[PDB]
Amino acid sequence: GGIFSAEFLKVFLPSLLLSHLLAIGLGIYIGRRLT
Amino acid sequence: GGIFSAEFLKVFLPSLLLSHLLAIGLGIYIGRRLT
Structure with missing residues (x-):
């Protein structure tokens, strides 16, 4: 079981996608x- | 709990970090x- 779970997952999965896009941009x- | 959990996670956390590094590299x- 996780502490945040919702609060974390709610803004985790989608974050990975956005991060990847931004990462490439930086390069x-x-x-x-x-x- | 789940079947893998520990194992699966053991090869999921370090992946995110590597992904970010690679992402920037590609850019x-x-x-x-x-x-």
Whole structure:
């Protein structure tokens, strides 16, 4: 059993998706701004 | 409880971390490729 469970899961699964998208964006940002 | 739980989780937590790292890496590769 988890403590937060709902409060955590409610904003966990969807977070992973958003995080991935943002992560990739960061990579491009750095590259595009190399020189 | 569930069948795996411990085992499954043992190979689920460290995955999220690796995913994030890889995600950012991909983004960079794309950017540096265009520039």
